[PDB]
Design a protein around this nucleic acid. Structure first.
Lengths: 71, 71, 71, 71, 71, 71, 71, 71, 71, 71, 71, 71
DNA sequence: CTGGAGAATCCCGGTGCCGAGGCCGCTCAATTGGTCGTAGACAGCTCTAGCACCGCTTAAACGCACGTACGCGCTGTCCCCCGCGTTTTAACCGCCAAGGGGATTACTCCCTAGTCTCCAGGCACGTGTCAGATATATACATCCTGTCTGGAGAATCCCGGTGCCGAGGCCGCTCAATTG
DNA sequence: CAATTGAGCGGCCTCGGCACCGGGATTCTCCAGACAGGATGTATATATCTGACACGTGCCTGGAGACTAGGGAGTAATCCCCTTGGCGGTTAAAACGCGGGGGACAGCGCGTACGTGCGTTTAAGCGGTGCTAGAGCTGTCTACGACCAATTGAGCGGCCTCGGCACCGGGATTCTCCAG
């Protein structure tokens, strides 16, 4: 569902909320968490791609992701 | 791989980095991004579960996720 | 002085710094500590008010302050 | 009340919670907020006193409070 | 009052300003806030309708509002 | 519905989207627009309350809302 | 020079400034204009890619560029 | 193609849209983006030339481009 | 009234609306016209001051106002 | 001076240019700004009078000025 | 150099970049940092001047700068 | 004064606030603005130094400052 | 077309800023001498644009069903009117503290020579990519009931005056601590 | 070491923080009722892993470019010392926001019905890959044009001072705009 807004599988975002200690989880909470992870992940990935390319490279590497998350 | 450290499918974290504009993506960058999403998602989910339970409820809902992300 | 920036009495912020072990205390240090306590207290109080209201209540209670400080 | 645990006047901690937007405030919430401000203020003041004395001075100044809060 | 300029109920725009922390609220401030919300909401809604129709649809959906607000 | 997340009446947010030119409007789009108006209105109202109080006043006035929207 | 900051050829950005009526053009003005075109073009292209993908397509088309420029 | 309407090389406008994240790019989208960059660049360059000449100079400099873009 | 929002005398803004052909003029229309003239005049004056200073001068002159209005 | 060309008091148009940041202001710049405000204000007022009369009214109101400025 | 674009002394902007940990610093990086500080400082100062004047004062004070930076 | 907290000359921070339009400027406002510029400049410079070193270089360059400010 | 009432009008008073004059000096313009950095002309390596070929991605076509619009239901709300007091604004004194001034300094900006180091080119290894199969964990019903939401009523305890001490803030004198 | 700066100790008197009663509305508790999350079971479209390919990265090498260090002259930042403009208390009295009470209107909801958006396939666009040729963008070197820096003169903007023009403000009146 809403594949542009939530990138990840719903069954995996639900597993994450239930391992955080949830006794029950609403389907709307799984969709909201999926959207919040996707928006935040997209911000880090966009900045890591600019760091890769400033470095002089086509390939995104572990160090570019690590530096972009620290911003 | 490393299912406690990276919760999401690697093929979906790779798709996110390539839609951010990546020309090529290292497997270590996919693993690092998966770990960074998992650690941040776990922090929000743990706090949303405490908001649900303070409210008086067993169920995590959309509003608890929304309030926990705003913290 | 500066009642929007420093909420607390200066004589009480000075007593706190002198019980921390200060041999002498500058008036600018009392004003800076008052401002730092006020800015941090305002952040916790604003979030505790959103927790009260999510809970369904007009009244801020001890548990809302306790949960907001743990954020 | 509890002058070692809450350093500030209760009427001033209550004013802070009501300017954060509180419609009503419990006396236990005023006491809990006073305790949380006091414990956090004491940690900063104790470290600022060690910075003053490392610097070679008896007087706590604005810059020592500012550096201790940034820790 | 002024139903083209302020779309929302005045009692609901006043409630929003008082939950933001207002001790008292002028009727002109309620009218100005209503106008500012209406002008900004109309800009987002007009652009979301063009996104719906570019997509090939008569119906405005959640994703069109979300994409129009991000512009 | 979701009265903390959407402050305004749904029938009034729907009227706004249909006067922007919408042929049809999804209930999720009405809820998303209500949330986006509420989050943006809350940011302006919180800053207008700080301008009122810096000015030396308990009352939020038209000029404080106007200055806060221009920020 | 500075291929991440200025995307276009300098000889083509210089031709544009001289057809605007310039009698002489500084090399720093050619570099500044190249950077300003690149930053603005990147903003439009990033938003057109999100419109393409909301539409359900991998391909950026003329209508997505046209709608993104009108934002 | 259409050298008065699109000033820049098509291969460079295509590279810009693909680094914005495009999976595929239509030739009409490359032509439309080239035209939109050219029309906007011409407006800034024409105004920067009037600023140069008001200043008393034949040469367009970095500061004239910077001031014209801020208009 | 509202001297920051309306800069000009109300009796002079009213004379302007009545010479435009108005049979009667509301006091709120005089206040709205005063605000609209003030906001637009402030935008031109701020840009004319930057043109004066780019030119190398402390004095705003007729040519700086004329160039700023043409922007 | 030139009361048909500049409607406003010169002392008030000068105050506006000096609050925009002017260190010094030429009398010709005050006259040019007065003329530019008068010509633009007359265009809005003439159109607001036609909106009032289309509406069926002799009185120019706040909403007619607001709609005429948005044209 | 470029005194409208970079307000501060270059020797002081260079000292700041070298205390941030720089082993070597390019003269173009000192000029770019000076410009970025100047543009951001000008935005805060312009808004603090509007807060001073809304308050009813000719003098910019510490509290106006503090409130303008928090915007 | 306070050379660790305010890096820039006070006469240059005062000139910036007076060109923003200030009729008068308090010495405490000059000190507060100097501190706010220094804290923000230090954050950008520290991150630009990490970008330089990730790139493989000892020298901070214009592009590293530009990328660090965009974070 | 008709009734009822906000509110723009026309009048009169008085006072506050607009406008005009005269005087003083900072500021903008012109003029000159050297220099930075532009325009012109020339060689060659580069990346642009243009066929030709292959297939991924697209735009229609149409057939189930998700979820919208129209209609009609109650009652939960907002908007309006009145009475009451608090908050704000305007007018007046008195003291910080910004302003404008002159003098001496520190630290800035520019020119220098010496060389560390960032860029460019040509190389060999690492590894991300593209295509193919396997099987697993995802998403979508379906049936059940656990949980959350309401609704109504005790009663807890926070809001709202109250009087009165407590202690926070201010001023002045002093010499200990900090700065240079 | 020397000589300020400004924090400490002191004495008076205000603001405002505290503790005490009363009134009451917000909160919690106890059932009833219906969403909607959970658990089971299926079909399948994903994610994962392989293996063969070659493009991209990292290495080592050389050359020039631009940063570092060192010196000098000039300057603008800083620091008193003085003047006074203006920020801030004090206050007295309208302005208008709060609070309580009524009443219709419009927002929410529940059902019904069919419109339309999503899904599955089809055929043909047309974008991607690949190679070739060449007209561009680039970099150099040359030299002179025009920009910047320093100066001098005068013009016009800034400051102050008058006085009177007109903007602002009631107050009584009736037009006219809003409702129905």
């Amino acid at each position: 569902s809403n594949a542009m807004a939530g990138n990840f599988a719903n069954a995996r975002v639900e597993k994450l909320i239930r391992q955080a200690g949830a006794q029950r989880v609403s389907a709307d909470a799984v969709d909201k968490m999926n959207e919040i992870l996707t928006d935040w992940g997209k911000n880090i990935a966009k900045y890591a791609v600019e760091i890769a390319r400033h470095s002089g490279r086509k390939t995104v590497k572990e160090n570019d992701i690590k530096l972009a998350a620290q911003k």
